[PDB]
Amino acid sequence: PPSGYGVLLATHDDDTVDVFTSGRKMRLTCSPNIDAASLKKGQTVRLNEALTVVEAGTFEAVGEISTLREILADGHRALVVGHADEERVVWLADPLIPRKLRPGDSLLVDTKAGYAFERIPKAEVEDLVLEEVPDVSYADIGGLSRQIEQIRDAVELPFLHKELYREYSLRPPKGVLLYGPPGCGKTLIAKAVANSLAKKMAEVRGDDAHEAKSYFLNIKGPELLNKFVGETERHIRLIFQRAREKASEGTPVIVFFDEMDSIFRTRGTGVSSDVETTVVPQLLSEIDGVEGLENVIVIGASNREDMIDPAILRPGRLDVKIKIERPDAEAAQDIYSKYLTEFLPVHADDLAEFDGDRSACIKAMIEKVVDRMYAEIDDNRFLEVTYANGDKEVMYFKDFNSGAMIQNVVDRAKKNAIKSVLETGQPGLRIQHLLDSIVDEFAENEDLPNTTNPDDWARISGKKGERIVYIRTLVT
Amino acid sequence: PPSGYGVLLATHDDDTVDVFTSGRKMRLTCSPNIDAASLKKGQTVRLNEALTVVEAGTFEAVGEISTLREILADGHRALVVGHADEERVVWLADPLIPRKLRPGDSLLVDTKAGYAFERIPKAEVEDLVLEEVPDVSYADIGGLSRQIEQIRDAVELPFLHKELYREYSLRPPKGVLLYGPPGCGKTLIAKAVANSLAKKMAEVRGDDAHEAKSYFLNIKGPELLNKFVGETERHIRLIFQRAREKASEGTPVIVFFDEMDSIFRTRGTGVSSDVETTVVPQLLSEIDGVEGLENVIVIGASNREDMIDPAILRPGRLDVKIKIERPDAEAAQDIYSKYLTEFLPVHADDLAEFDGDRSACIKAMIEKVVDRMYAEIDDNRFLEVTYANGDKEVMYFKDFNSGAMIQNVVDRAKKNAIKSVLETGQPGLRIQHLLDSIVDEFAENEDLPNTTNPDDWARISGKKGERIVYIRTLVT
Amino acid sequence: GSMAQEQTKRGGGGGDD
Ligand SMILES: Nc1ncnc2c1ncn2[C@@H]1O[C@H](COP(=O)(O)OP(=O)(O)OP(=O)(O)O)[C@@H](O)[C@H]1O
Ligand SMILES: Nc1ncnc2c1ncn2[C@@H]1O[C@H](COP(=O)(O)OP(=O)(O)OP(=O)(O)O)[C@@H](O)[C@H]1O
Ligand SMILES: [Mg+2]
Ligand SMILES: [Mg+2]
């Protein structure tokens, strides 16, 4: 019953095998049960007090990890550097002699034995950001059809028809940018494309969730910035190496950068710090250089289109610049339909007029509420934009509208309904509740604007030809 | 029979030899089977239960790596320094005492035995700078017939006719710089140069698999920055030392620096801790040097030549300078001809217009699209510029055209053609597809401008004579 | 006198056992 263990090193024609055991190298004879032909270098074997190899086993799974330095000419050995800058030449085991063991890979190794087995880095923490795949799909996004069509053509279409693209000698777009006013739905598309990619990977390759999620990376913005000089660039290089490794000309890898302005700037706008002055060239070289990413798509989302560096906002890097505009009446109706589901409880007062037809009643309520909020009445007057020319312009609450505001209004209406059912005991959302929620929201978001706001007024000022000099809230 | 191993130390006349085993040196006799004369210093021998040398093999193949510092006077001892700067004296092995033992080389050593078994060439420069050879050739570059001539001469002519160069005592230039607006062909020229050099080296010598491309050292901008204080300077010195060693009279060594903006920044004027005052002087001293570096050419690519240090741009160090500009009408036609190959499928109507003449139809399409792009019409008015006094100057898209956006236009036209094929079923590409692609590309790119003054803005201000003070988009 | 951040550079340490 008491049996030892050891590490196989090499094989000979004398039916003998070299085994490292107890800190010493010995040569031993294999039992007749085991055949030496199937043995491979680095395999773990079982020993005994009689010192005979009895059975082979899987390779070692734990130990110190050492960054690979270089691959020797023979191919059976490689130079690897330890944690404290110690360099050793170690044999390469069977599994490493799949993806080539390219230099710069921290290989799992045993210093005493002198053999390698595996590797990995910290960029996987990005994959840990998307531990839960969002369940929102394209069916849950309303008011945007051309934008969804473009984003599907940029990502899903090239991989849906490989032969047609090959015949026309067309490659999938290298990058996609999404820009627009806050709350217009950029992150919704950003997470819907990730959900679709996860579904595709689950249905095509395998049902395992981790591998499916491994094809989407979430940067989160300034997560790359680090304390030490030259470490953020190394992190970016590792991220792009990880991206290029997973690509196979039929499996896209989507690296999503959120709030592009956080880490990318014009290299001169940095006042307190100029880390972007070094970060930007590294990413530019990674995206397009002597060696270019064959099958990697970079999706960036930002709220300040102009503040990004011109080099990034160039064809060949960010091919399609999708613009998401503030919802109009039709988009508002679509969003309300997406939120005011048919299954929500509705008061019998509302169903009395429409014989209990829930769908027709909800559609009529949605049309009434969107008409109420999209009304050019003196009660909806918000601001007076002036210019040097003098063409004073009256803006309404409808101009500063987005899907987030619609969701907030629906939530407030639901809260009012729940308060009413708690106090009185009659359930059901009412039409008057939505109107009250609208006016309360427009009252709550009244004293927001500051002295000067370059958020969305720059475009209007350029349209009118003159710059804004005064704005006032026109209430009471 | 389990038998342990050991390492031979010395040979004595009594047929008894010293063997290092189990971490200690013991004087052991040799079996009559083995010959004492056949044994060599540092050769691994076999032991047994009686600790008798029975079989002698080869020298050790794994262990630590220590750089050779100095061979002692007797020649049987060598002093080396370890990873943590420990000085140790070792005995050279029989093969060490063709290949030449030189100071500074790395040796495979074992601390316990204190022997050096082989010399392992580190060749660390072969790592982190080699890449797969791109397939771009000189024939794939259009609109640049003067700059390509300059760079081709500066790279080939000193090596095409060496005797004539030596007759005039003309040294080959050692500094080539490429600068211009983004997406104009700098990296394209670099890739073409790398491909041509790799093909030439594969023609001249063998080892086509590897080392053939070793003569092109591609370095990304921030790739050389390191966390430690002196590691980056040592990396610079090592790269330049290898470039000096690898260089020959007939074999050029091209060390390409991509994204020249990051490194070589003007000394000082850094708000963050991006200390260039240490790295930049190292590069200057390596390139210029107390002794002239021979058979080396450094190529740098950047779109921001203003932030580069004046010293590195001094003539003689980076004398050869090349400017790549925005393509004109003729250059745009050349680029379109480069991309719109005759092999691209064409619609039946277009072929029927010219009776199936492929070249005539292609050139007609190219001429029409080029004329539409560069026409001065109201719809192509991109930007409006107001100077200090100046006038209302109008910049059209022809003032911002580039090869990258031409490629993007062709790509999206092909995508539209594929969409039409999928929806209608008629293969081919229409001129209307090109026009729709052009208008869509301009609509997507008309959000680029920002309140900044790059080199193009400086050129425009110099032409007008007044500084740029206002820029606005012509949305309506 | 705009306030500015910093990025430090580590120095290697010699440790045995
Ligand atoms: N069709 C729609 N258009 C816009 N917003 C919608 C739509 N449907 C739902 N929303 C709601 O709008 C909210 C904001 O969307 P999203 O998170 O995409 O904007 P965002 O990308 O965060 O904007 P920013 O990044 O500028 O803050 C979401 O919580 C979502 O519930
Ligand atoms: N004759 C040409 N002139 C300009 N661009 C071309 C030409 N032919 C092809 N291109 C396309 O232009 C694209 C960009 O070229 P290149 O990579 O050399 O510029 P770049 O170095 O990326 O510029 P930057 O580094 O400032 O962004 C290439 O992908 C290439 O396909
Ligand atoms: Mg967002
Ligand atoms: Mg470039």
Residue numbers in the entry:
A (entry chain E), B (entry chain B): 97 to 193, 211 to 589
C (entry chain G): -1 to 15
Quote the study on this structure.
To improve the local resolution of Mpa, we performed local 3D classification and 3D refinement combined with signal subtraction of the 20S CP (see “Methods”). The two states correspond to two distinct motor conformations stalled at sequential stages of substrate translocation. The loop of the penultimate protomer (protomer 6, cyan), which was at the bottom of the staircase in state A, is retracted away from the substrate in state B and has shifted upward by 25 Å to a more distal position relative to the proteasome gate. In state B in comparison, all protomers of Mpa are resolved with ATP bound, including protomer 6 (cyan) with its pore loop now in a disengaged and retracted conformation. Nevertheless, protomer 6 still exhibits less contacts to protomer 5, and the arginine finger that it contributes to protomer 5 does not contact the nucleotide, thereby creating a fissure in the ATPase ring between these protomers.
In mycobacteria and other members of Actinobacteria, prokaryotic ubiquitin-like protein (Pup) serves as a degradation tag post-translationally conjugated to target proteins for their recruitment to the mycobacterial proteasome ATPase (Mpa).
